[PDB]
Structure 1
Amino acid sequence: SGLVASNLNLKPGESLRVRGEVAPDAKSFVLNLGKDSNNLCLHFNPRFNAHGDANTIVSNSKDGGAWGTEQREAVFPFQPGSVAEVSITFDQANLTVKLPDGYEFKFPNRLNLEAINYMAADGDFKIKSVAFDGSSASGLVASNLNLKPGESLRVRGEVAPDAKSFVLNLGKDSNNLCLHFNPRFNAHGDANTIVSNSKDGGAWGTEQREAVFPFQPGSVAEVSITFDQANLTVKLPDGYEFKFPNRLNLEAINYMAADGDFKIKSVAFD
């Protein structure tokens, strides 16, 4: 199992674009989309050699844990040991899935979900990035990460025109953060101040504040965070970096949550 993206708000007409690596010995992979793990508007399952299928896409819904009627396509534009991109557009009547070869297909919204709040990846596909339309990842929670020492995540977003604050939290869970990263445009009596902190068993550590503030209301921004056991390296927009001490005993980052006045356009996992 890989990434579980939750707290999404993919509204009708909006898409997510998942790019990943198909394993050299791929048998099967899954992208599960919907409300939660039990309530899927799309179980998208390319089966290379699994479940009685060879080189066949199987799609289904999952309602209260129950599988529905399966749909199989003829096209199979996936190859072990290659990069593939899959786009899923949410809509009220039908989802649209766009595959690597140009091919598209429809899958009915049977649960009549209002939005996609949840995407999980499983099987023989290593997610490299997820890209999001509109404000669908504004509250993104990325769980079941396994960001090991030396590994980075890259967040690209648009700061809101009237932005007060945004946050990127990285650690084990919401109470155990090796980095709470908090650019404050105008929040908690700080103006244009980056505040960083740890959180250990729910308790805030000692803040670190930066001098530079390479963010602007309304501007796109890219932030990269590299996890190492001693320090995290934060690559701020436009060629600035700083380090933040890792004050927790985590040996990997399993959790990233984004909130506030930053519309996440993509997350990439290096």
Structure 2
Amino acid sequence: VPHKSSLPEGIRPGTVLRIRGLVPPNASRFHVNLLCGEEQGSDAALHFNPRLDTSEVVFNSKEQGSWGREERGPGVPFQRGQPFEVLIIASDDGFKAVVGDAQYHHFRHRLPLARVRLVEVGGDVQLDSVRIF
């Protein structure tokens, strides 16, 4: 099961996305997206993309079909066959990514928070819960 849900209340500084899930034993990669529209080709304010196949975690945004400049977090705090907890925290200047007990990365806004409309979680991931606070 992939997660996809609209955000009718929008997201402001202090919005927290909590993702609890599991990386499958033969997983390659999964993703967390904050989209600015409802259909697949919409702009992405955030594309959070742990890649176990290439051993990296890529951050990026997407506008008018074009991926912006990639960012990467320090190491890979995900492991095949192991559960995880990710917090995506919105502030005025960006998104704070929290993995496990550690501040993992800070992704500064490319698109204004007011444009975020949808959260999507999918790929090689099994989900326990996806919550917006």
The question of a shared fold, defined as TM-score above 0.5 by the shorter chain, is answered with yes
Q: Which of the two has greater strand per residue? A: 1
Higher RCO by CA contacts (8 Å cutoff, separation 6 or greater):
2
Number of the residue aligned with 1:117 = none
Query: Conserved in 2, the CA contact under 8 Å of 1:172 and 1:250?
Result: no
Q: Report deviation, 1:218.
A: 0.8
Computed over aligned residues only, the root mean square deviation of the Cα atoms, in angstroms, reads 1.5
Could you tell me which runs of 5 or more consecutive residues in structure 2 were left unpaired when the two chains were aligned: none
In the superposition, the TM-score normalised over structure 2's length comes to 0.88
User: Gapped runs of 5+ residues in structure 1?
Assistant: 1-137
Corresponding residue number in structure 2 for 1:157: 21
- Select the structure of larger CA radius of gyration: 1
Question: Is the Cα contact below 8 Å between 1:183 and 1:194 reproduced in 2?
Answer: yes
CA distance in structure 2 between the partners assigned to 1:268 and 1:141 by the alignment: 11
Question: Following superposition of structure 1 onto structure 2, how do residues 1-270 of structure 1 map, counting pairs within 5 Å?
Answer: 138-145=1-8, 146-173=10-37, 174=40, 175-186=42-53, 191-251=54-114, 253-270=116-133
Q: CA deviation at 1:208?
A: 0.2
Question: CA offset at residue 246 of structure 1?
Answer: 0.7
Percentage of matched positions with identical amino acids? 34
Aligned length: 129
Whether the 8 Å contact between 2:13 and 2:90 is mirrored in structure 1 is yes
1:232 and 1:243 in contact (8 A); partners too: yes
- Structure 1 position 153, deviation (Å): 0.8
Task: Give yes or no for contact 1:229–1:251 (8 Å, CA) kept in 2.
Answer: no
Tell me the residue number matched to 1:84.
none
TM-score normalized by the length of structure 1: 0.45
Q: Pick closer, same or farther for the CA change 1:212–1:238 going to 2, 3 Å.
A: farther
